[PDB]
Design a protein around this ligand. Structure first.
Ligand SMILES: Nc1ncnc2c1ncn2[C@@H]1O[C@H](COP(=O)(O)OP(=O)(O)O)[C@@H](O)[C@H]1O
Ligand SMILES: Nc1ncnc2c1ncn2[C@@H]1O[C@H](COP(=O)(O)OP(=O)(O)O)[C@@H](O)[C@H]1O
Ligand SMILES: Nc1ncnc2c1ncn2[C@@H]1O[C@H](COP(=O)(O)OP(=O)(O)O)[C@@H](O)[C@H]1O
Ligand SMILES: Nc1ncnc2c1ncn2[C@@H]1O[C@H](COP(=O)(O)OP(=O)(O)O)[C@@H](O)[C@H]1O
Ligand SMILES: [Mg+2]
Ligand SMILES: [Mg+2]
Ligand SMILES: [Mg+2]
Ligand SMILES: [Mg+2]
Lengths: 429, 65, 171, 435, 422, 412
């Protein structure tokens, strides 16, 4: 949040109502065709109709592929689960690559649980049983509950007497009783009876506020992977499991099918609502042939999320193969299952716009001539390099007692720090 | 350290029974209070492995360890 | 949720079981013996609140008894008797089963327990007083569904039988 | 309406193989289009599976990419139903850090063989009309159940009293008691609790009163795969490993013991074998060791029907330097039948696009169908399928009702296929890494 | 009927009394020389004199190597251990290749141990806390004093007075199997299951014969499950895993088994290890097999290989006649399997049809044989069940030539698919 | 006594090196035949082992396959006393998934050095006469005695029920009571002093002291990379026992058959491992000529780098002549109780010279079986021809594989 990252200026796809990309909006400059296609992808995600649809962002380095993916994530909001991954992460030491992929697939399917609990809470004021003749016999147990709002008497079922003595509920004890089970739970002496001279901590609690009888709604957000992990290893066997290292496990399809069934039952019951989201796999060219093949089957599943791949490798040998070159380091079989969005190189003007937006986000005052000089540097070198010069030049200016970057500061910072190409030139010599 | 070690029964009681499953050790020769300046050589790696994992703990997790 | 389908499926017994090898020494060191003793004492003291759990979750399955289902399925007569007894019980009738063999009466006992039918056994090894007591109990207690009698038992001492159905298992 | 876990996938339109009684495929039935020879072969293989008399029959579905191999496999799965197990794995799934490749292939084979157990149980089922439990402060009790046909009063033992107390059985509950083990299950309530009781905030629907006799001889069917039996018998806490997958290499002696007792259970009346299907998609990811294991594994009597798919031609077998058809050794190819799929025509592609539009619920014009069929023939079938969804979204954005040609041209221009993306990559190759 | 496997028809070797192979007997057809050689090998195994003798079945694919091995297994019988294995199974993720080979070598040595089982059974009367418990049966009642471990086992079973329990004092295992049928009428409804009183004596000794491999003893002593003590119980919680059993343990088991054989309470039955795809092993496994086969304990080992002059796995450019290095080919006897003539193929196809319950006409059989002259024998056989399914669908109870033709048009062979790809 | 666990293997006929007191090898003695120079060298190495003064001596047995290198090693194992350890492993056995290669070689080295410890204990064995709880009365066939019981001894006798008439043995120092039956009563003295001598390898000490109940790892494996500190402390304690006289060191032999399977890392470890004072005598065997060292691209005279070859003496094994081959066949026939005619011996000797010695040894059993089938008593030429027809050698099998090369898989 507070610290400024490379993408902290990306606030979303700068699209209008008609689906066209503005020239510069929401921190994004250019990439009109790619932002429009990302807009159609965002609509696809929000439609929730389709499963396993894949899109490949493809283009040169520094063309906004990751910025466009995080812009899609911003457009989708915080409700939609957006799981970033990099292809290097599949090479785990605890579990197989296909398990890492399936786990990240299930992380991108969200589930929202809605629980509505009815509770009668308050300070107990009386526990008088109601004696009667049987058609000593009791037919009801009257409990008086006091809250800051008022007092209520409950004609509870006589069977609650067992739980009252089990919980050791006494007059002046704060309790709560759930409507469904009718079991009492004790939560400490009311703080109105606590003195400053006695020492106890857990056994005192403030008088409940609000009405004695309450209807509470608890909403929890989980992923299908969260349920998978919870049901795979529930928390002396617990002692040994907690002493030993709790490694990741290759969760079986049986558990996933059972959990799918349970979630479908919840959705039928209305307790839960699905929020299918997006798995973003950057540097997908780091995946090996076995991972891409697994992804063939994974993207054909009716449960899969929408996946966003990114590659810049061009015609490169596929990892885990020998001499098998493919247009992006991805086998042609997977490329037939993905839509490709091309990203294009920026013009000097777009580079200047991005530099200005970055300076704004970093809180840096940049002069017009300094901005022009840094843009012209960025038309050489790279965009990333020119952006990276912003804050060291601001610091150099602050040292010299200047509140704004002057061209001389850009010149000096360029003379201190070199780009990849200048270093390659020095190495060649 | 206050550590106490029972190093057997005194050999003066070896004839208290004809057949006992006990280890008789002779009465110490010197004074009751013994002083000795000593030196021990250890490596830093020994300290590293001593502090790597708890040892001598009476807790069940330490016993399992 | 698998418990019922787990217990129907847990059947493998290991071919061999052995206690761990025991390190045997003459003159075991006092320090080693004390360390092992205190280690075991601490483990038993800490396991005491969870000892039965450890026992159940570690003890191996060494025995494999034949399922009571097999007594009925190994004999066609027992199957036809099961069908007959079900039909007669639905009609609220009482059944007398006669067999010449004591071991066959024992097999009929296992078969009836498998069907949760209450029964009384009267063989020739039961004294006359015991035979009269058992028959009086059968007549008195209308809940006893079957009485199994040996044909070699001196049935001539039983005058009144409050049962309406007799089944001859063997001739 | 509501968003279920299962959404519209790449094969959601496949409902089966679309065959008649004579296994002669229809042109368009059960979501299948074309592939008449391949679908007829799949029908014959499905009959061979359903007969179950022959073990270890392997069929390989070989064809060009996008010709319907996975579609045919999913059709076989749909027409097989849930009763017969059908385990589908990617070939890359067997490469595990928890177990050897051969152990993974064994578990995949044993997962594709069901064991249908049968047992008879004594079940009491009725409405609780009165329950009395008296305890000191041994327990004594009396329970009366009704079932419209009769009303019987029971004198309760201590264990039954404990179970009834634990279940919190109350009058007006429709309960089920398993006389074999005393497990008590509540089916539902028959009428409300007393209105005079506070809390108890529920008005749940009341199930109808049971009928017939209170105690019935009920036969119940439980189906478990061989892998579940193996994992359960592998260790004391084996059942937990059925979900976590923390199964090491299960001892072969345990597997032999299970194979023997299962054979006894099928010689007796206790269980019935349901042999199913293991589908190894993209089988060319298997290495020589896995194919060599598959050779011997299919010779087992407990082996299921193995279905395989691959688009590789004569290619190098993984882990070796030898080239063989389909990326499979000739020794395994000898042990299987190959089914070939043919590329589609204009009519078949148009029918597939129509079915996909119907399943995605996209109304599209006939001129749009023609241009999309031309695109699919030119580029690929999957590309046209994905343009269906993209064009639907673009049409809904403009508040249109039917996807027209303008939407297809728009989404074609927005989203590239492999060929146009490759051409643009070559046009800017210096910008990409390592040429 | 049981499911029909690839080798179901094979019932033996079909040798006459003079050890010569009949042309068609016991499911096998042809391969007379190789059947006779496997005959001499079966006699060698039955002689129980030689340890570690190895034989290699080498020949083209489909020429009966696995069928011959299973015919040997059938001729030996169920008494003689037979451990079928694949070379690719040695690449365990848990234990080293040499441990897998050694464990398979030890599996193939059997041991019939007669063990005296003493069982106490009855209905419990008293459970006085060492414990003096009582058991009652159809004969009488006895009072017994037992170790506190047996009492802890009873508590694990939660045995209460009036329950019928089965105590195997040898293994210290107690099985509570029900409450006595006498109590079965006391309550109209109870959660327990009732069982009749035992008819025999309270304490009974029964002599039983147990068949175990040496590997069973090895694994039992390596990971003990019988400690029933605090430390062993805590160890049993640990995740089970194959362990690299040491030579010390195997030597101790050898000494124990020798003592058993000397006492006469055990008999040792050397069996066969069969490695189907020996070319899947690597040079490390072959180097270990050199030492392993020279041991005086090793079983008779049978190898199969269909490779030509191919590269040995784990080497760079070393080629050998079957993928097995020349140093191991010197230690084995080689049996050659020859290609089948069309008449032998027709006989094998007829046998496979008769095993699968399939009726086939003479013209259909001849067409299937012709199909087998091209393609392969396995393919021609594999067309039987699809063609019978099409016959049943077409309302015929026998395969005709038209059904064979239709199935051959539906399903392609390896050569046809290769031609299509090329 | 039928079908013992030990059966007739490849090296069962070898009972020793067959050498005189001058280490002159007899032409045929103790199962050995020929290899006179190599057997003399093996005897010199055996004397080195028996003396045990020098540490880290390495010997390599080199020769063509079948020239009796493993046979020489087995003979050296047999001639060497069973008290002295003789660890024999194959070179592929060090590639463990539970320990590093250097750790496996370390454990193998430490398994080849034994610590011999003698200690006395007092054992009481007799027949119980009367037990009072305490007093205990024991008697033999020659003497009777009454003992006054201690609290711990009373507890021991209470835990293990002992009554009059039982025959039991009691360890006086520990109270270990085991009942061996009820009454033959022991004859001699009731209380006896017994010395007991255990030989414990350094590896057994290391593993026993590695962890609580560490001795279980001596059987199941499960021994991780044992800490170097424990090994150093044990080496120092063992040196202290040797100085104090409480223990004696018995240096043994580690035999690595087909050592060429080791990699350059293992050989580099062996280079320094043989330089410790507790290093045993290392013996290796290899048939490789100049061939590539595993894990490197470098070729070496035996697949072993020249660093290690400089630390060892090489024993060469020659081919056998006709006479030696015939004598080996005779000894194998005697080992397997097979009677052959002289012409059959000549034919088998010709086959062994032409094709292989192991092939002839296998044909011995094959011909014996074929003779037993035909109700014969002595193996004839017809049986050798029959088994030669049924069973192929590598050369003939290769020639047939070339004849039908088109039918085999990956043939080149
Ligand atoms: N069109 C754009 N508008 C605004 N900022 C951009 C644009 N393209 C890239 N950036 C920013 O410049 C940097 C480029 O990095 P990134 O988008 O990750 O490129 P790549 O495509 O190589 O992953 C990021 O900080 C990104 O936020
Ligand atoms: N005959 C057919 N009928 C209906 N849909 C098909 C057919 N063939 C292919 N498809 C669909 O077209 C796409 C092609 O992918 P797939 O069937 O997996 O081809 P392959 O497995 O051969 O690569 C899938 O969405 C598939 O469902
Ligand atoms: N001589 C034979 N007689 C009858 N059936 C045979 C014969 N040889 C092989 N078969 C059968 O033909 C099939 C080929 O298997 P097989 O030849 O044993 O494989 P391989 O020998 O290559 O391991 C199997 O079903 C086998 O049972
Ligand atoms: N000098 C010998 N005397 C007796 N038997 C021998 C002799 N040399 C070799 N043999 C026997 O011949 C066979 C092959 O010899 P072996 O030592 O295994 O060769 P390698 O050196 O290849 O291991 C074995 O059965 C072995 O016992
Ligand atoms: Mg990026
Ligand atoms: Mg596919
Ligand atoms: Mg084979
Ligand atoms: Mg050798």
């Amino acid at each position: 949040t507070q610290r400024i990252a490379s993408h902290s200026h990306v606030k979303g796809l700068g699209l209008d109502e008609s689906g066209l990309a503005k020239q510069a909006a929401s921190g994004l400059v250019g990439q009109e065709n790619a932002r429009e296609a990302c807009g159609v992808i965002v609509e696809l995600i929000k439609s929730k109709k389709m499963a396993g649809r894949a899109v490949l962002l493809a283009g040169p380095p520094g063309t906004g592929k990751t910025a466009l993916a995080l812009a899609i994530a911003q457009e989708l909001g915080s409700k939609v689960p957006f799981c970033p991954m990099v292809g290097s992460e599949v090479y785990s030491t605890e579990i197989k690559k296909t398990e890492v992929l399936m786990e990240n697939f299930r992380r991108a399917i969200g589930l929202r649980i809605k629980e509505t609990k009815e509770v009668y809470e308050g300070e107990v004021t009386e526990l008088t049983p109601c004696e009667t003749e049987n058609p000593k016999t009791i037919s009801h147990v009257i409990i008086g509950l006091k809250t800051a709002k008022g007092t209520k008497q409950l004609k509870l079922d006589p069977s609650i007497f067992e739980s009252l003595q089990k919980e050791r509920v006494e007059a002046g004890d704060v309790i709560y009783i759930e409507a469904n089970s009718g079991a009492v739970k004790r939560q400490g002496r009311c703080d109105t009876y606590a003195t400053e001279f006695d020492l106890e901590a857990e056994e005192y609690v403030p008088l409940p506020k609000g009405d004695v009888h309450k209807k509470k709604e608890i909403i929890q957000d989980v992923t299908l992977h969260d349920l998978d992990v919870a049901n795979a290893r529930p928390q002396i066997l617990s002692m040994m499991g907690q002493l030993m290292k709790p490694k990741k496990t290759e969760i079986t399809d049986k558990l996933r099918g059972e959990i799918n069934k349970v979630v479908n039952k919840y959705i039928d019951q209305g307790i839960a609502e699905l929020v299918p989201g997006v798995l973003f796999v950057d540097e997908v060219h780091m995946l090996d042939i076995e991972c891409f093949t697994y992804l063939h089957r994974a993207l054909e599943s009716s449960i899969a999320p929408i996946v966003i791949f990114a590659s810049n490798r061009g015609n490169c040998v596929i990892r885990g193969t020998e001499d098998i070159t493919s247009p992006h380091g991805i086998p042609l079989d997977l490329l037939d299952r993905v839509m490709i969005i091309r990203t294009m190189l920026y013009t000097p003007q777009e580079m200047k716009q991005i530099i200005k937006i970055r300076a704004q986000t970093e809180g840096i005052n940049i002069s017009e001539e300094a901005l022009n000089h840094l843009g012209e540097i960025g038309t050489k070198t790279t965009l990333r390099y020119s952006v990276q010069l912003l804050t060291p030049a601001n610091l150099l200016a602050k040292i010299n007692g200047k509140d704004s970057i002057e061209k001389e500061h850009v010149e000096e910072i360029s003379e201190l720090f070199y780009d990849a190409k200048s270093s390659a030139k020095i190495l060649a010599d | 350290s206050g550590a106490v070690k029972r190093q057997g029964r005194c050999d003066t009681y070896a004839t208290e029974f004809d057949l006992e499953a006990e280890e008789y050790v002779p009465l110490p020769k010197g004074d009751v209070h013994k002083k000795k300046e000593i030196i021990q050589d250890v490596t830093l790696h020994d300290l590293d492995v001593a502090n790597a994992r708890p040892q001598g703990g009476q807790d069940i997790l330490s016993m399992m360890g | 949720s698998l418990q019922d389908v787990i217990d129907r499926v847990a059947f493998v017994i290991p071919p061999v079981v052995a206690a761990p090898p025991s390190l045997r020494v003459p003159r075991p060191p006092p320090l080693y013996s004390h360390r092992m003793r205190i280690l075991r004492q601490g483990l038993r003291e800490h396991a005491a609140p969870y000892f039965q759990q450890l026992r159940q979750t570690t003890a191996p399955r060494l025995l494999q008894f034949p399922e009571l289902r097999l007594v009925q399925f190994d004999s066609g007569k027992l199957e036809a008797l099961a069908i007959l007894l079900q039909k007669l019980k639905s009609e609220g009738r009482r059944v007398l089963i006669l067999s010449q063999m004591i071991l066959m009466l024992d097999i009929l006992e296992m078969f009836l327990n498998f069907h949760y039918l209450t029964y009384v056994r009267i063989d020739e090894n039961a004294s006359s007083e015991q035979r009269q007591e058992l028959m009086r109990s059968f007549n008195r207690d209308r809940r006893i569904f079957c009485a199994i009698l040996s044909t070699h038992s001196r049935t001539t001492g039983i005058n009144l039988v409050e049962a309406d159905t007799v089944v001859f298992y063997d001739n | 309406d509501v968003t279920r876990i299962e959404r519209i996938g790449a094969h959601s339109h496949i409902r089966g193989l679309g065959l008649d009684d004579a296994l002669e495929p229809r042109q368009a039935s059960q979501g299948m289009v074309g592939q008449l020879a391949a679908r007829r072969a799949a029908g014959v293989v499905l009959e061979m599976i359903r007969e179950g008399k022959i073990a270890g029959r392997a069929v390989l579905i070989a064809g060009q990419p996008g010709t319907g191999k996975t579609a045919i496999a999913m059709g076989m799965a749909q027409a097989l139903g849930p009763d017969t197990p059908f385990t589908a794995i990617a070939g890359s799934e067997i490469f595990s850090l928890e177990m050897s490749k051969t152990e993974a292939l064994t578990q995949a084979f044993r997962r594709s063989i069901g064991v249908r157990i049968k047992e008879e149980t004594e079940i009491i089922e009725g409405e609780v009309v009165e329950i009395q439990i008296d305890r000191p402060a041994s327990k004594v009790g009396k329970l009366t159940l009704k079932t419209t046909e009769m009303e019987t009063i029971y004198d309760l033992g201590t264990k039954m009293i404990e179970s009834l107390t634990k279940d919190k059985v109350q009058a007006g509950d429709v309960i089920t008691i398993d006389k074999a083990t005393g497990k008590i299950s509540k089916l539902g309530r028959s009428f409300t609790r007393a209105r005079d009781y506070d809390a108890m905030g529920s008005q749940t629907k009341f199930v109808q009163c049971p009928d017939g006799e209170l105690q019935k001889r009920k036969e119940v069917v439980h189906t478990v795969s061989l892998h579940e039996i193996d994992v359960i018998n592998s260790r004391t806490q084996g059942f937990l490993a059925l979900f976590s997958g923390d199964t090491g290499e299960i001892k072969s002696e345990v597997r032999e013991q299970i194979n023997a007792k299962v054979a006894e259970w099928r010689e007796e009346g206790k269980a019935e074998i349901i042999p199913g299907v293991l589908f190894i998609d993209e089988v060319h990811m298997l290495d020589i060791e896995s194919f060599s294991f598959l050779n011997r594994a299919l010779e087992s009597d407990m082996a299921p029907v193995l279905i395989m798919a691959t688009n590789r031609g004569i290619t190098r077998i993984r882990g070796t330097s030898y080239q063989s058809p389909h990326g499979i050794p000739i020794d395994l190819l000898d042990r299987l039948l190959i089914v070939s799929t043919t590329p589609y025509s204009e009519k078949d592609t148009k029918q597939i696009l129509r079915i996909r539009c119907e399943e995605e619920d996209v109304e599209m014009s006939e001129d749009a169908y023609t241009v999309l069929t031309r695109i699919g023939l030119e580029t690929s079938l999957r590309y046209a399928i994905q343009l269906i969804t993209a064009a639907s979204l673009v049409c809904r954005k403009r508040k249109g009702t039917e996807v027209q040609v303008d939407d297809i041209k728009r989404v074609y221009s927005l989203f590239l296929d492999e060929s146009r993306s490759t051409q643009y990559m070559k046009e800017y190759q210096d910008a990409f890494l390592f040429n």
